[PDB]
Each structure stands twice: as structure tokens, then as C-alpha cells.
Amino acid sequence: MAGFVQAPLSQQRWVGGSVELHCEAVGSPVPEIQWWFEGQGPNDICSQLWDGARLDRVHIHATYHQHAASTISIDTLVEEDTGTYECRASNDPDRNHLTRAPRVKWVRAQAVVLVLE
Amino acid sequence: AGFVQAPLSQQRWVGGSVELHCEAVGSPVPEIQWWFEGQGPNDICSQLWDGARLDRVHIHATYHQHAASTISIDTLVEEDTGTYECRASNDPDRNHLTRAPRVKWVRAQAVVLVLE
Numbered sequence: 001m002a003g004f005v006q007a008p009l010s011q012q013r014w015v016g017g018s019v020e021l022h023c024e025a026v027g028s029p030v031p032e033i034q035w036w037f038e039g040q041g042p043n044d045i046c047s048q049l050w051d052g053a054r055l056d057r058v059h060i061h062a063t064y065h066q067h068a069a070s071t072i073s074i075d076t077l078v079e080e081d082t083g084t085y086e087c088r089a090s091n092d093p094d095r096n097h098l099t100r101a102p103r104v105k106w107v108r109a110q111a112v113v114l115v116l117e
Numbered sequence: 118a119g120f121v122q123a124p125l126s127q128q129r130w131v132g133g134s135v136e137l138h139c140e141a142v143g144s145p146v147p148e149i150q151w152w153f154e155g156q157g158p159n160d161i162c163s164q165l166w167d168g169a170r171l172d173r174v175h176i177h178a179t180y181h182q183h184a185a186s187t188i189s190i191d192t193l194v195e196e197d198t199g200t201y202e203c204r205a206s207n208d209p210d211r212n213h214l215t216r217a218p219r220v221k222w223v224r225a226q227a228v229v230l231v232l233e
Contacts (some may be wrong), residue, residue, distance in 0.1 A: 001228050003126030010119025010143070010223060037150075084221070102158055105200070109123050109225045 001087040002031035005067070008111035015117045017077050023087035023109065025068040026102065033070040034106070035060055036086040046086065054081070082115045118143035118205050121183070131187035131233050133193050139203035139225065141184040147207040149178055149186035151224070155199040162202060170197075193231045202226045 006024035013019045025031045038046040049072065051060040057075040062068070067087060074081055088106035095104060119144050122140035141147050154162040165188065167176040178186035184205060190197055204222040212219060 001126045001129065001230055002125035004225065005125065005226055007123035007225050008118040009121065022162070107126065107200070107226045107228060109120065110223045111119050112223055 002027040002068075002091050002107050004087075004089065004107060004109050007109040008072075008085060008087055010035045010112040011114075013077055013081075013113060013115050015077055015079060015115060016113075019074050019077060019081070019113055019115075021072045021085055021087075021111055021113070023068075023070045023072075023089075025087075025089035025107070026087070027068075027091040029091045030064045031068045031089040031091040032064075033062060033068045035070065036088060036108075037083055038058065038086070039080060039083040044083065046084075046112045049085075077115045079115050079117070082113065084110050084112050086110045118147040118207050118223050120203075120205065120223065120225045123225035124188075124201060124203050126228040126230075128230045128232065129193050130233055131193055131195060133231075134189065134191055134192060135197075135229055135231075136187060136189045137201055137203075137227055137229070139184075139186045139188075139205075141203075141205035141223070143184075143207045145206070146163050146180045146182065146204040147184045147208045148180075148211060151176060151186070151188045152202040152204055152205045153199060154202075155196060160199070162200075165201075195231050195233065198229060198231045200226055200228050 010022040059073045062070040090106040124137035143149040
């Protein structure tokens with residue numbers, strides 16, 4: 001099982017500024033962390049972020065020594081960076097690949113980031 | 118509304134007890150709720166309440182400056198296994214007053230595994 005020892009923090013930021021969200025988890029084995037995101041307005045859905053996203057303004061750095069630590073950073077914010085950011089952790093051996101596996105459940109921890117002019 | 122402490126996943130024995138804690142901030146001070154989803158594809162997240170599961174589930178919360186909430190479960194059974202989720206919000210329409218714009222609470226999860 002994976003468990004959170006630090007959740008990301010909701011916060012108010014400015015267009016052209018920047019944001020940094022942090023997430024930490026424990027388990028044995030040491031769990032994996034991903035970051036997920038969902039904009040505002042009931043047309044946006046929860047999908048995975050990746051290192052280099054949004055024209056290379058999104059950066060994700062992770063370490064896995066004894067526990068999982070992950071920092072997501074975003075350069076030069078724009079209003080549409082507004083939304084909910086979700087850290088997910090799991091040490092389930094099947095979480096990746098494809099498998100006809102049912103399971104596949106990660107623990108989630110959300111922060112909301114609001115970007116204002 | 119955001120978390121400054123997420124609940125922490127825990128493994129326990131049948132017949133034992135568990136306790137999960139949740140800290141959240143915002144102005145105004147956000148409300149905390151606990152929600153739960155058992156294992157297997159046929160379960161959903163539903164709100165837990167104080168006294169649930171034949172008065173084995175107790176929920177205590179305070180809201181001075183910070184939102185602090187604790188869920189406790191006595192005499193654990195196997196079907197207590199699953200994902201517990203702390204939800205927080207200070208949105209004034211929170212109590213889904215039929216007022217049907219949004220509904221979005223911030224969420225932080227912990228898993229609880231109860232082994233025989």
C-alpha cells in the first residue's frame with residue numbers, strides 16, 4: 001500500500017508568475033508518483049501531466065530513495081493553468097503496462113491552483 | 118481550501134482499531150467530510166457519517182483557524198478494507214442546495230487494509 005506524508009497545497013497565483021507543488025509518499029516497495037490535472041468548466045477531464053507539458057513550461061522532478069518525493073513546477077503561468085492538480089501514488093506491481101487487470105487504483109491527493117490576472 | 122495533512126494509509130488486524138486524520142485550511146475555514154469506497158468493481162464512494170456501521174465509526178472535527186477532523190473505527194472487520202477519503206471545501210453553495218452550478222471538493226485519500 002502507498003500512503004501520503006505530504007500533500008500538495010492549494011494556492012493563489014498570478015498570470016506570468018509561477019507555481020510549485022510538492023508531494024511525498026511512503027510504502028514498501030517505494031511507491032511511484034504521477035501528477036494529474038483537470039481544468040475548470042464541466043468540459044475538462046482528469047488526464048496525466050508529463051515532464052515538458054504545456055510547451056515545456058511544466059516540469060516534474062522525482063526521487064525514490066527510501067520514500068517518494070515529487071515536485072511539479074510550472075513556468076510563466078496563464079489563466080488556463082487554473083485547475084485541480086492531483087498527486088497519485090502506488091507501489092502496485094501492475095499499476096503500469098496494460099494487463100486485463102481490474103485493480104489499478106492509486107491513492108490521490110488534490111490541490112487547487114487558481115491563476116488570476 | 119487545500120490540505121496541510123492528508124490521511125495516512127494503514128494496515129490493521131481484524132478485531133483491531135484504526136484512526137485516520139485530516140488537516141485543511143482556507144478562509145473561511147473549510148468543512149471536512151469523510152467518504153469511503155470498498156474493494157471490488159461493484160462499490161462506489163459514499164459519505165461516511167458519525168455512528169455509521171452499527172456505531173463502529175466515529176467522526177470528531179474542530180474548526181478554529183484550521184479544519185481538523187479525525188475518523189475512528191472500532192473492532193475492525195475485513196469489509197472495513199478500502200479507500201477512505203477526506204474532502205474539504207469552504208464554498209458557500211457546498212451543501213448542494215440544488216443550486217446546480219458546480220460541486221467540487223478537494224480530496225485526499227488513504228487506504229486501510231484489514232487482514233484476518
